């Protein structure tokens, strides 16, 4: 009933981003399948790079020196403490930065859908400010599909929308 | 009529941390930290490890009678040894350069025992000598299978030459007897002489007679110290000895690998499993980039870190409207 | 008199982001307290993460070898050179990247306040292009407060606004 | 004839971002020189930082040990494997991340030009949804230059625009 | 009627660098690089260092008479030594494996001197011998407090055994006399023999008689070379000597810690201050993640970097409306 | 009338990878990875390397008659040695501590050979001895130019003292003869003694006579083992020898540098070129941050990585409207 401004939708079950419509023929949730897939491929690519770029040298446990070489064993230990601190700090900050960016990426994708719809409708709708548009003309299932597919024609519905705008203006 | 733009919510309880916010609920996430302890010892990339059972590596190599002999040509990805092996070096002495030897034989593609010296060639001397500190069964007296303790030299010079006509390097191990006193020296060798020079390729190793008492260990105030060398394809080795010497009657032909693994110290048995990365407290059979299980590992491994968790957000902020 | 497009306000003394209103009753600066507090928490969290994640192994100064072991001392010295070059490069770029993002973060928060006001007013105001809105009806302190609190009623003022817009379209 | 929404322009040859216009006098491409220069300085600063921050200790090849110290030579070898894996991973992820951001940066800069035109024209134009604006009044070369320079006067063409809009509304 | 959206400017002169721009003015910012020099030597985490005053570590451990004696049990977080100690090894000779010893004693939870050997138990021999190279003051011949120089063996074999019955390891330090010539060997020992074996746990150390001239150093062409070992809890040590031996009459029970610190080399005094991280040029009492003060440090420290500054923007671009 | 906002496209075939997408066409890009193999050996920051031609470093240092004598005072930024030098240590024996020595002489600001000992000072002795194992441009017997083999000592003690009064440290190299048997020992020295002590500063090095046969190597069952040491400014060295000594007649004065480089192993010759970074398979004359050419390098170098490519996007997504 309300849009992305107020939160997420339990009812959107076939994708990441999408639409909810209401008209005389009924209502429903529908995923923007293409925006979802594109975001899925991007996130999968990100996760797979973080994983697959770790292509390592063969790891050895041969780290022993003779009993009169404790100083060398200590060097081996502080080498490993050195790398432990590098990898720990870097891994920790990578996760925190990437999580911030991943959440923003989702916000940018949702905003893009909103902007795409906003610009098709123009003043044939009133932006309700909650992620929803109040459409100023009868918008049936074919009309809804056209908005979703990006093929909505402003001028087709301009006259009817303008008359509806008049009584609001009173 | 209305159309709304929105996004997916679900019943996930997963949360993630970001640089700006803590404990943010998300619809899905993915861990990049392997954290699982399973305690299994496996094969490494389909290659089995050498299981020393209750023996130490030096005991297995020299052939402590209580250790299983190597009968067939074999290979292994790494070596599994008990934390405190029951069967170690039985005649007290030091095994020289054990750390460097591990680098050579911790991962091998071919490994085979062979007789190298016919001990019957030397005369006026006794051979295959034995000791109650190295028994097979209780109250017995035996000795390392691979090594041949020669006695009663009486100061006589024994000379031996060998060429490696195989295409793999040859590992040999020998011993040098430090006697407790002149009387023992006489009892064992019949002369106050007994020094040995062994030559491998162009390296010369000389062991002059040393007579000196030590503390009693496993019944012995005397010592036999062990040394090893590698003879390369077409390389020669030679021995000159007037006594006090334990001969490398047997040796091992072997083929090196490029990847050095090491010894996994564990009480556990090898299980019927396979892993790309192994530690002494379990397999890390994962390609995730990080792990917090153990500092030391072998194989194709994630990097060790001390993070408790490293969870990437994949999904959306899980903030459904009422 | 002008807004964010043209620069910051020395007169905004009690917050990071906010408003300046002008009506018949008076004029003045006021912070958006909630947008400010939210941003402060985010930046505090960022800084505290960058500092607190440096959780290190105990550091030792035992790096000595015997006089016939200079090759080992040299190994120990190049180990420290190695970590020095790692930490120095990574610390520099981290600061450079995090500063770029912190500044973008502030821009995004200001733009958000802007968008929120804009979608509330709709055509009840003219966007002057400098971060300010010329509103087409008398807007008293309660009205100004409502705009700031997000409870402005577009339909309450539609009629008065339309009349003034007509006088403008001439 | 279409804009950034649908892709780039081979015809824009003197800058990174810019405009294409169409009026009675004719048509043509023109770079936004200022926005281009600002972005160029930004990207040059980025690449130079990534390169110049690599200020290193003097590198040596003295890494040998005697024939009875193979365990020390092994420690030396794994120290280099260690640094090898640290630099490889971090260099790879640095490039992947910076490339994602450089592309977003270009997108942001194009969006800025678009927002700046949109807010000047307001309802004197119809947003065609493809990166272009259909202007509701005659807009000669001077007028076009004013839009590109940010000095376009809304109220000067309002009456003419309102007349053309009412015709569309029929 | 008008409403505007805007943001905060102030009079700040701070600037930051970003990946894209240099020297950008901001309303506030925060450094994450510790830069401050204070030159103080402090307690580390509430725990005081061992002040060696003007002695070297070996001189203090062995009890050079010019160094202060450890009268009561103590502990310390690190060792503070002058760069060039006035009082070092007085009887010339080498101190074996000092680097390995530092790893053991640089950070201790307990350290207590105790008499290990009753030197009256030996007969036909002189003890507590003394030398002009180790004075307590000018012309006052003396010797290390902890090490007992035994002479006039005449080839007689002395025997000693000790059992560590504490829960703390025991550090012992001894010396072996290399005489210059047969005549010197005679006046000190009365025989052309003088060899020692010292056994600690399973380990045997043998020091045969060495008679050989060296260059004169502080009046001496002979040498006393020093060695040390650790007797673990429930372990024993024993000594068999026929001469040329400086006995470990006193030793130190000590409790190891996990965190190895080391020796801080400096002429400064220890001040009344506490820090989480110490360097030889001053304390880095900071939780900032980086420092550019010194490559070597001890404790809970920021990482050393070459940067001149590392400043994070926290506030806004400070670009007030003209 | 219309106005549109747009951006640049071109016919670049360049692609980059990002965290979200692979092979994205862009209008421009810039590699930060140096990849080019040129196979040149160069000067390093304007400083020439030392070219050993076909001598090994010890053979050159000692002055094997078959390599070129250093005549002038010289300097070098690194050392260039053949992988398999034709001319090495001609008289069989070990060269002590080569690796530590390399750290001292790999990069020098000044390097100059001088005569240190006047060998004509010794009577009843033969000097400048010669051997068929160390021949000239063939054949005829000779010896290392810097090292003077003294014979026919007949148990007589020789004594030498030297003071370094120069302001640079001095490198000296000496040898000690291990004879095969008593008959050989008598043939060379005329007596069954031959022991040497060389003191440098406060360090004493003692080489007692060793008679022991080895394998025949270049016509020799005996050996000469080589040692070296550094005499600091205002320090002395001395030698006491009764035989079996090869004297350090010549030495090198040198000036140490702060930047340790090492030995470049290659068969290539030095080219008239100049680089800031050198590897043994070519120069890396670049300020790029990373390189994938070789693990081992010298100078001011990019970091070694395993990547095949590191390409930063600079331009825009190259997706022109159809
Ligand atoms: C650290 O040293 C401890 C003492 O060392 C001994 O004295 C030194 C000065 C030196 O001479 C060294 O060579 C000596 O061995 C040592 O503890 C000793 O261990 C001995 C066994 O190795 C043990 O010998 C036994 O002595 C018994 C004598 O009677 C006991 O009770 C008497 C009551 O007054 C009194 O005299 C003492 O309390 C005596 O201990 C014998 O009864 C016994 O005979 C058995 O063994 C014979 C041969 O093996 C058999 O033929 C016979 O049939 C019996 O079975 C045996 O000789 C010493 O008593 C013992 N000394 C003390 C004071 O405890 C530590 O070694 C052992 O530690 C003991 C406690 C055990 O755990 C044992 O297994 C350890 O090996 C030693 N610690 C280490 C780590 O080596
Ligand atoms: C971005 O690439 C554009 C495409 O280039 C084409 O693909 C490249 C990968 C490469 O293989 C190139 O050879 C291809 O041409 C490029 O645009 C091209 O520019 C060419 C240079 O003038 C031009 O060549 C002409 O082609 C004529 C062929 O006729 C056209 O129509 C034919 C229908 O069947 C078909 O063949 C193609 O569609 C052809 O375009 C030739 O007749 C003409 O010959 C004259 O000039 C020759 C040398 O200049 C003389 O030797 C000869 O005697 C004649 O006088 C000439 O070969 C391509 O037509 C043109 N392609 C298209 C589709 O426009 C861009 O470079 C240039 O773009 C043109 C339009 C100009 O603006 C020019 O200033 C640009 O440099 C290139 N973008 C940039 C900025 O470089
Ligand atoms: C590097 O070696 C230097 C030379 O070593 C000496 O000769 C070698 C060949 C070898 O035999 C070696 O064993 C010799 O010691 C050495 O410099 C020497 O240091 C000696 C003291 O350690 C010193 O002895 C003094 O000799 C004086 C007489 O000689 C002077 O006059 C002579 C005739 O005109 C002339 O031939 C000499 O060159 C001198 O100019 C004695 O007067 C003096 O006795 C007095 O002082 C003693 C203590 O100071 C008292 O005990 C005594 O009662 C008298 O009052 C003393 O015996 C040598 O002269 C000196 N040789 C030279 C040529 O200088 C370096 O060590 C010392 O350097 C000297 C200058 C001091 O600074 C000292 O502190 C240094 O240790 C030596 N360098 C090092 C670092 O070891
Ligand atoms: C000895 O030095 C160590 C440093 O590491 C060393 O550990 C030794 C055992 C040894 O192996 C050595 O080689 C190795 O380098 C010190 O241990 C660190 O110091 C303290 C412990 O008091 C810890 O710092 C604080 O940790 C607090 C709590 O931990 C946090 O838990 C919560 C979980 O909700 C979470 O916020 C984080 O995960 C934290 O881990 C924090 O409140 C506080 O702010 C500090 O950060 C630190 O974690 C310890 N590290 C390790 C590896 O143990 C010892 O204190 C030194 N020993 C002595 C007696 O001084
Ligand atoms: C031996 O281990 C290497 C590890 O890489 C390095 O190369 C070695 C030759 C040696 O120099 C080591 O010290 C180095 O660390 C490993 O090679 C890697 O294997 C992984 C397996 O997942 C590959 O993904 C990766 O590409 C590869 N990396 C490198 C740098 O080569 C070897 O495994 C591979 O060996 C090659 C010869 C093939 O048999 C291949 O199928 C196998 O994965 C490993 N060698 C063996 C025989 O196991
Ligand atoms: C020796 O190598 C220098 C690299 O850094 C070294 O510093 C030494 C003191 C020593 O600790 C080495 O272990 C360590 O690796 C190098 O100096 C570097 O030059 C950079 C050029 O941009 C400067 O940033 C900086 O001075 C220095 N880098 C660092 C991190 O210290 C020397 O080469 C250059 O030295 C500087 C001072 C220049 O002015 C020139 O004299 C010279 O090109 C190098 N010395 C020599 C003689 O090659
Ligand atoms: C381009 O269009 C503009 C907008 O109408 C014209 O400029 C305006 O002219 C009116 C009077 O005609 C004047 O009141 C405005 O101040 C002026 N606005 C702008 C944006 O400058 C312009 O026509 C006029 O140009 C001016 C400079 C003058 O020469 C006048 O005589 C002329 O009619 C248009 N330019 C052309 C060549 O058509
Ligand atoms: C849904 O409504 C749309 C919009 O009116 C209808 O599309 C038009 O239908 C009218 C009358 O049938 C025609 O005059 C137009 O030619 C149609 N225009 C388009 C967009 O094709 C559509 O027919 C309606 N669909 C249903 C199922 O009633
Ligand atoms: C290894 O030993 C063999 C002997 O079994 C050596 O072969 C002889 O070499 C000498 C000179 O090198 C020749 O004169 C003989 O003709 C060879 N005899 C045989 C039967 O081959 C061989 O040279 C030795 N290897 C080395 C490196 O000395
Ligand atoms: C502020 O402006 C509004 C709009 O003209 C007026 O407040 C209205 O007053 C009456 C009863 O209070 C009702 O028409 C509305 O419920 C009120 N609107 C609001 C904003 O609640 C009034 O002119 C002004 N209010 C004050 C404080 O004078
Ligand atoms: C290494 O790079 C430097 C810097 O580009 C080169 O030095 C230049 O060499 C050219 C000759 O081709 C001369 O103009 C100057 O000596 C340098 N250029 C300037 C203007 O500074 C050097 O030639 C490169 N080394 C090699 C052989 O690749
Ligand atoms: C170190 O930090 C603590 C806690 O802030 C403080 O009490 C103490 O004064 C500091 N020590 C120094 C060196 O000032």
Residue numbers in the entry:
A (entry chain F), C (entry chain D), D (entry chain B): 6 to 175
B (entry chain E), E (entry chain C), F (entry chain A): 11 to 53, 53A, 54 to 81, 81A, 82 to 96, 96A, 97 to 125, 125A, ...
Source paper text:
Two highly similar crystal structures of the A/bat/Peru/10 HA ectodomain were independently determined to 2.15 and 2.24 Å resolution (Cα r.m.s.d. of 0.25 Å and 0.34 Å between equivalent monomers and trimers). The overall H18 HA trimer is similar to other HA structures with a membrane-distal globular head comprising the RBS and the vestigial esterase domain, and a membrane-proximal stem region containing the putative monobasic HA1/HA2 cleavage site and fusion peptide. The H18 HA ectodomain was expressed in the HA0 form. Tryptic digestion of HA0 at pH 8.0 resulted in specific cleavage to HA1/HA2, suggesting A/bat/Peru/10 HA also requires processing to be functional for infection. In contrast, H18 HA has a dramatic alteration of the binding site residues where only three (Trp153, His183, and Tyr195) of the key RBS residues in influenza A viruses are conserved, although Glu190 and Gly225 represent consensus sequences in avian HAs. Significantly, Leu194 in influenza A and B viruses, another critical residue for sialic acid binding, is replaced by Tyr194 in H18. Together with other larger residues, including Asp136, Gln155, and Asp228, which are unique to H18 and H17 HA bat proteins, the addition of Tyr194 dramatically flattens and widens the RBS as compared to pandemic 2009 H1 and other HAs. The glycerol side chain of a canonical sialic acid would clash with Tyr194 and Asp228. In addition, Asp136, which is not found in H1–H16, would electrostatically repulse the sialic acid carboxylate. The crystal structure and glycan array analysis of A/bat/Peru/10 HA indicate that sialic acid is not the receptor for attachment to host cells, consistent with similar analyses of bat NAL that showed substitution of catalytic residues and no sialidase activity in recombinant bat NAL preparations.
We have characterized a new influenza virus from a flat-faced fruit bat (Artibeus planirostris) in the Amazon River basin in northern Peru. While our phylogenetic analysis indicated that the Peruvian bat virus shares common ancestry with recently identified Guatemalan H17N10 bat viruses, their genetic and phylogenetic divergence is such that we propose that their HA and NA genes be designated as new subtypes H18 and N11, respectively. The influenza HA and NA proteins are critical for interaction with the host and determining the subtype of influenza type A viruses. We determined crystal structures of the A/bat/Peru/10 HA and NAL proteins expressed in a baculovirus system.
